[PDB]
Each structure stands twice: as structure tokens, then as C-alpha cells.
Design a protein around this ligand. Structure first.
Ligand SMILES: CCN(CC)Cc1ccc(CNC(=O)N2CCN(c3ncccn3)CC2)cc1
Length: 142
């Protein structure tokens, strides 16, 4: 039969000016994450999240295979971060790719506390992957 399942992801980041910079002239702490809304376990359908940091970072490929799906770092500039959310799906789609705007607060602006809400729509998932989406607190849309 036909069924379409929606699940929600929240991508987000925090950034703040360090009271004093680091030795390396890193002015900021930031943290970037992927999570579910309240009372959802996205781990049921998320295999892993890959955060692609700027080439300027060492081991810039950061993999979270279980919650929390987050990177914590200090740096001196914002950048565009590819974030891959890989699914426990045996068919397409196998993952989804976001271009995350990791910007910093500059010149004594308040800390950054940003959230990006994403709705994934899966058309006619397999029985297997449909279970996982539901277990995670996904919703049928018909
Ligand atoms: C906005 C586009 N442009 C600048 C306008 C290029 C650019 C963007 C971001 C960055 C961020 N880079 C950074 O903050 N990092 C921290 C970690 N670093 C490090 N270095 C040694 C050991 C460990 N970590 C490397 C430097 C840079 C350039």
C-alpha cells in the first residue's frame, strides 16, 4: 500500500567569544548538533551524522554514530559545514545532506544560539525502515 512518513530533525549551533582567546588565537567556542524534537529518538532511523568541518581543521570528517550528534570546537571564523545524516535505510534515500551556516558572533554581539528545523518526508518506505521512522516518533501523512 501507499504511505508517506514525516520525521523532524533539528540542526543548530551555539557560538560565544572566549573571555580570552586561546594560544592559537581561537576567539570562539562553538558547538553544532543534530537532534530530534522532545521525546523522539532519531537514533532508530539515523545510522550516523558526519560533520564536514573547514579544511583548516585537522580530521575535519567528524562522525557521530550515536547521540549526541554534535561537534564542540574553538575557532576564529564561521564557515559553511556540510552535514550528512545517514539512515538505517536499505533503499534510497540512504542519507540527506545539509549545508549548515556556522556563523560566529563578532564585535561584542550576544552569543549565537540557532536552530534549523527540517522535515523529512519518506514516500513509501520499506516495511523495515518504516518501523524505524515510526519508533523514532515519525507520523503517517494520509
Ligand atoms: C569564512 C571563510 N574564510 C575566512 C574569511 C576562510 C576560513 C573559514 C573558517 C575558518 C575556521 N578555522 C578555524 O577557526 N580553525 C580552528 C581550528 N584550527 C586548528 N589549528 C591547529 C590545530 C587545531 N585546530 C584551525 C583553524 C578558517 C578560514
Amino acid at each position: 500500500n501507499q504511505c508517506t512518513v514525516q520525521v523532524r530533525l533539528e540542526l543548530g549551533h551555539r557560538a560565544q567569544l572566549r573571555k580570552k582567546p586561546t594560544t592559537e588565537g581561537f576567539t570562539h567556542d562553538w558547538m553544532v548538533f543534530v537532534r530530534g524534537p522532545e521525546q523522539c529518538d532519531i537514533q532508530h532511523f539515523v545510522e550516523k551524522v558526519v560533520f564536514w568541518l573547514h579544511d583548516s581543521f585537522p580530521k575535519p570528517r567528524r562522525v557521530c554514530k550515536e547521540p549526541p550528534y554534535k561537534v564542540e570546537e574553538s575557532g576564529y571564523a564561521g564557515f559553511i559545514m556540510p552535514i550528512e545524516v545517514h539512515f538505517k535505510n536499505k533503499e534510497e534515500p540512504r542519507k540527506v545532506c545539509f549545508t549548515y551556516d556556522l556563523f560566529l558572533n563578532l564585535e561584542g554581539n550576544p552569543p549565537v544560539n540557532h536552530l534549523r528545523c527540517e522535515k523529512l518526508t519518506f514516500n513509501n518506505p520499506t516495511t523495515e525502515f518504516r518501523y524505524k521512522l515510526l519508533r523514532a516518533g515519525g507520523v503517517m501523512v494520509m
